[PDB]
Every structure is written in structure tokens, then in C-alpha cells.
Amino acid sequence: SCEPGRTFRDRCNTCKCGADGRSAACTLRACP
């Protein structure tokens, strides 16, 4: 579901894809 090590947007949130491409750590923020 994600490219390992890639930083991507999900809504206005910023996510880093985990090594397995099967996980991510997300910084949550509001959209306008």
C-alpha cells in the first residue's frame, strides 16, 4: 500500500512509508 521510505501526503497529513511497504508513521494536521 506504500513505497518503503517514501514521504507522502494523506489528506493534509504527512506520512513516511515503513520498510515493509505495509506500514507508515503519520504527522496529523487539518486541511483548509
mmCIF file of C-alpha atoms in Angstrom:
data_model
loop_
_atom_site.group_PDB
_atom_site.id
_atom_site.type_symbol
_atom_site.label_atom_id
_atom_site.label_comp_id
_atom_site.label_asym_id
_atom_site.label_seq_id
_atom_site.Cartn_x
_atom_site.Cartn_y
_atom_site.Cartn_z
ATOM 1 C CA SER A 1 0.000 0.000 0.000
ATOM 2 C CA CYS A 2 3.086 2.367 0.214
ATOM 3 C CA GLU A 3 6.655 2.627 -1.267
ATOM 4 C CA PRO A 4 9.150 1.913 1.538
ATOM 5 C CA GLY A 5 10.985 5.072 2.794
ATOM 6 C CA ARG A 6 8.704 7.374 0.700
ATOM 7 C CA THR A 7 7.201 10.530 2.300
ATOM 8 C CA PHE A 8 3.608 11.032 1.027
ATOM 9 C CA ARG A 9 0.514 13.173 1.785
ATOM 10 C CA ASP A 10 -2.725 11.584 3.090
ATOM 11 C CA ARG A 11 -5.308 14.363 3.374
ATOM 12 C CA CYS A 12 -3.060 17.210 4.635
ATOM 13 C CA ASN A 13 -1.235 14.645 6.901
ATOM 14 C CA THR A 14 2.431 13.750 6.186
ATOM 15 C CA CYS A 15 3.325 10.026 6.259
ATOM 16 C CA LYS A 16 6.640 8.136 5.951
ATOM 17 C CA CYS A 17 6.200 4.576 4.489
ATOM 18 C CA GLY A 18 7.808 1.810 6.671
ATOM 19 C CA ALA A 19 10.397 -0.687 5.344
ATOM 20 C CA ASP A 20 7.771 -3.426 4.599
ATOM 21 C CA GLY A 21 5.615 -1.078 2.411
ATOM 22 C CA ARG A 22 2.902 -2.265 4.783
ATOM 23 C CA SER A 23 3.072 0.480 7.448
ATOM 24 C CA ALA A 24 3.543 4.222 7.995
ATOM 25 C CA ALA A 25 4.005 6.866 10.722
ATOM 26 C CA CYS A 26 1.855 9.938 10.114
ATOM 27 C CA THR A 27 2.033 13.581 11.306
ATOM 28 C CA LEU A 28 -1.656 14.655 11.625
ATOM 29 C CA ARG A 29 -2.798 18.185 10.604
ATOM 30 C CA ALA A 30 -6.058 19.935 9.475
ATOM 31 C CA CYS A 31 -6.955 20.623 5.800
ATOM 32 C CA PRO A 32 -8.299 24.101 4.798
#
